[PDB]
Design an enzyme around this catalytic site. Structure first.
Site, PDB file in Angstrom:
ATOM      1  N   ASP A  35       0.828  -1.204   0.000  1.00 42.01           N
ATOM      2  CA  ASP A  35       0.000   0.000   0.000  1.00 42.01           C
ATOM      3  C   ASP A  35       0.869   1.264   0.000  1.00 42.01           C
ATOM      4  OD1 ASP A  35      -1.946   1.924   0.316  1.00 42.01           O
ATOM      5  OD2 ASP A  35      -2.516   1.349   2.361  1.00 42.01           O
ATOM      6  N   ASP A 221      -1.217   5.402  -5.589  1.00 41.67           N
ATOM      7  CA  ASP A 221      -1.666   4.599  -4.449  1.00 41.67           C
ATOM      8  C   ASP A 221      -2.047   3.173  -4.841  1.00 41.67           C
ATOM      9  OD1 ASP A 221      -2.684   3.560  -2.135  1.00 41.67           O
ATOM     10  OD2 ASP A 221      -4.455   4.851  -2.051  1.00 41.67           O
TER      11      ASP A 221
HETATM   12  C1  LIG Z   1      -9.751  -3.857  -2.133  1.00 45.22           C
HETATM   13  C2  LIG Z   1      -8.375  -3.296  -2.544  1.00 45.22           C
HETATM   14  C3  LIG Z   1      -7.999  -3.400  -3.901  1.00 45.22           C
HETATM   15  C4  LIG Z   1      -6.763  -2.913  -4.374  1.00 45.22           C
HETATM   16  C5  LIG Z   1      -6.436  -3.061  -5.762  1.00 45.22           C
HETATM   17  N1  LIG Z   1      -6.188  -3.226  -6.876  1.00 45.22           N
HETATM   18  C6  LIG Z   1      -5.884  -2.299  -3.460  1.00 45.22           C
HETATM   19  N2  LIG Z   1      -6.257  -2.208  -2.149  1.00 45.22           N
HETATM   20  C7  LIG Z   1      -7.448  -2.678  -1.655  1.00 45.22           C
HETATM   21  C8  LIG Z   1      -7.660  -2.486  -0.166  1.00 45.22           C
HETATM   22  O1  LIG Z   1      -8.294  -3.319   0.477  1.00 45.22           O
HETATM   23  N3  LIG Z   1      -7.121  -1.365   0.368  1.00 45.22           N
HETATM   24  C9  LIG Z   1      -7.231  -0.859   1.697  1.00 45.22           C
HETATM   25  C10 LIG Z   1      -8.000  -1.453   2.735  1.00 45.22           C
HETATM   26  C11 LIG Z   1      -8.051  -0.847   4.004  1.00 45.22           C
HETATM   27  C12 LIG Z   1      -7.342   0.347   4.250  1.00 45.22           C
HETATM   28  F1  LIG Z   1      -7.464   0.845   5.470  1.00 45.22           F
HETATM   29  C13 LIG Z   1      -6.547   0.974   3.235  1.00 45.22           C
HETATM   30  C14 LIG Z   1      -5.742   2.304   3.456  1.00 45.22           C
HETATM   31  C15 LIG Z   1      -4.748   2.192   4.649  1.00 45.22           C
HETATM   32  C16 LIG Z   1      -6.774   3.452   3.701  1.00 45.22           C
HETATM   33  O2  LIG Z   1      -7.387   3.711   2.425  1.00 45.22           O
HETATM   34  C17 LIG Z   1      -6.523   4.130   1.336  1.00 45.22           C
HETATM   35  C18 LIG Z   1      -7.296   3.785   0.023  1.00 45.22           C
HETATM   36  C19 LIG Z   1      -6.333   5.673   1.467  1.00 45.22           C
HETATM   37  F2  LIG Z   1      -5.488   6.013   2.479  1.00 45.22           F
HETATM   38  F3  LIG Z   1      -5.807   6.165   0.310  1.00 45.22           F
HETATM   39  F4  LIG Z   1      -7.539   6.268   1.692  1.00 45.22           F
HETATM   40  C20 LIG Z   1      -5.168   3.392   1.371  1.00 45.22           C
HETATM   41  N4  LIG Z   1      -4.336   3.617   0.380  1.00 45.22           N
HETATM   42  N5  LIG Z   1      -4.833   2.575   2.320  1.00 45.22           N
HETATM   43  C21 LIG Z   1      -6.524   0.326   1.971  1.00 45.22           C
END
Ligand SMILES: Cc1cc(C#N)cnc1C(=O)Nc1ccc(F)c([C@]2(C)CO[C@@](C)(C(F)(F)F)C(N)=N2)c1
EC number: 3.4.23.46
Length: 379
Positions: A35, A221
């Site tokens: 991430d 991202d």
């Molecule tokens: C389904 C999925 C599909 C793909 C693809 N292809 C990639 N990732 C996911 C996923 O589960 N991601 C995800 C789940 C929980 C979270 F708490 C976060 C956090 C830390 C917060 O949310 C954002 C988006 C941000 F900060 F930008 F708002 C971030 N980048 N990280 C991300």
């Protein structure tokens, strides 16, 4: 070695790319979401219906409790955890083990996803957005400080349709891309913030003041699925895409990204959807390069056995109120170099880039712009 690091990522479409990691002594193996849009290393550390396994601190003799808590609420989900440190390694990454901060997640709401197959998140962005504050050193910072690994990593995310992926830490792997690598400056070290200077849809310029493209920031991202655009830009993009594909009828809320559209297997009309070009600020004044995005990227295939007689897709462009996000569907098909040492991000066509017989994803430059406006929204 980089060859040892190749193909160290897995994923399910729309669920995220994860790498295998170990935490604690002896090592406990976990799958961890990669991430670039966050900066905490946070792992499930208690039973949860959607977790196949979790971090058991009592079984690690190297765990150290920091006696401090952290609460992290996100748009939909949230988690609570205890902060500590422990030994961490990436079995198919650099040949090292480091001590790193770990947020042990004890409570969560709508954070863990059923079937995702990951148990934590590796936030690869900068300390400025770490929780609870910028004093909690992120994993990659710890890694660089404690080892001799160069301050750089690269991601090759591959869609299901083209040859999963690779995270290479400490350098650039040339077998993972073809053509030139083009760099855009990192505007500010918090998110991986970059500057979009021009947007075209099927070669047609959207002709907006370029600051509009970067309201209120633009980031790269890997923890976001979609291309996310500011309201104004999103509307212009949807209008242009709608116009181009007008020969076909789409379900009501398709453009909201809620509803599936399906075609008979193999018959998806790719040619009626336009390419999107994003021009990113170059390293030289008023130069830029463009990355070009095919419908094979922004129409995301939704894998469901129940719908598998057809090819079905969701519209993977959505409206944002917090700026542009170049998410996974954008990064897919490109080799993306997060060159932290030189404060820049590189793009090149990857071995698993998307294309058909007529069109292909591309990274092209240089382009020159006469107007000398700073396209950044916030100085
Ligand atoms: C389904 C999925 C599909 C793909 C693809 N292809 C990639 N990732 C996911 C996923 O589960 N991601 C995800 C789940 C929980 C979270 F708490 C976060 C956090 C830390 C917060 O949310 C954002 C988006 C941000 F900060 F930008 F708002 C971030 N980048 N990280 C991300």
């Amino acid at each position: 070695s980089f060859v040892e690091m190749v193909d160290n990522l897995r994923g399910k479409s729309g669920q995220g790319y994860y790498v295998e990691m170990t935490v604690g002594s002896p090592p406990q193996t976990l799958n961890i979401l990669v991430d670039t849009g966050s900066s905490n290393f946070a792992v499930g550390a208690a039973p949860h219906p959607f977790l196949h396994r979790y971090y058991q601190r009592q079984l690690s003799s190297t765990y150290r409790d920091l006696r401090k808590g952290v609460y992290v609420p996100y748009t939909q989900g949230k988690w609570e955890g205890e902060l500590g440190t422990d030994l961490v390694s990436i079995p198919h990454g650099p040949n090292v083990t480091v001590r790193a901060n770990i947020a042990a997640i004890t409570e969560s709401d709508k954070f863990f996803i059923n079937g995702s197959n990951w148990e934590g998140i590796l936030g690869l962005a900068y300390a400025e957005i770490a929780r609870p504050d910028d004093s909690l050193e992120p994993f990659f910072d710890s890694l660089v400080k404690q080892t001799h690994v160069p301050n750089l990593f690269s991601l090759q995310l591959c869609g299901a349709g083209f040859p999963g992926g690779s995270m290479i830490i400490g350098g650039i792997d040339h077998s993972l891309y073809t053509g030139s690598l083009w760099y855009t400056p990192i505007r500010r070290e918090w998110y991986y913030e970059v500057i979009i200077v021009r947007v075209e849809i099927n070669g047609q310029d959207l002709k907006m003041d370029c600051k509009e493209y970067n309201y209120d920031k633009s980031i790269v991202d890997s923890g976001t699925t979609n291309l996310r655009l500011p309201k104004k830009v999103f509307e212009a993009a949807v209008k242009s895409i709608k116009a181009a594909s007008s020969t076909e009828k789409f379900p009501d809320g398709f453009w909201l990204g809620e509803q599936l559209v399906c075609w008979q297997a193999g018959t998806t009309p790719w040619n009626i959807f336009p390419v999107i070009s994003l021009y990113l600020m170059g390293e030289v004044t008023n130069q830029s390069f463009r990355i070009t995005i095919l419908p094979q990227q922004y129409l995301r295939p939704v894998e469901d056995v129940a719908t598998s007689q057809d090819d079905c897709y969701k519209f993977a462009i959505s409206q944002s109120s917090t700026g542009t996000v170049m998410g996974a569907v954008i990064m897919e098909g490109f080799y993306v170099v997060f060159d932290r040492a030189r404060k820049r991000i590189g793009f090149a066509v990857s071995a698993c880039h998307v294309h058909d017989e007529f069109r292909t994803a591309a990274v092209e430059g240089p382009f020159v712009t006469l107007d000398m406006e700073d396209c950044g929204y916030n100085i």
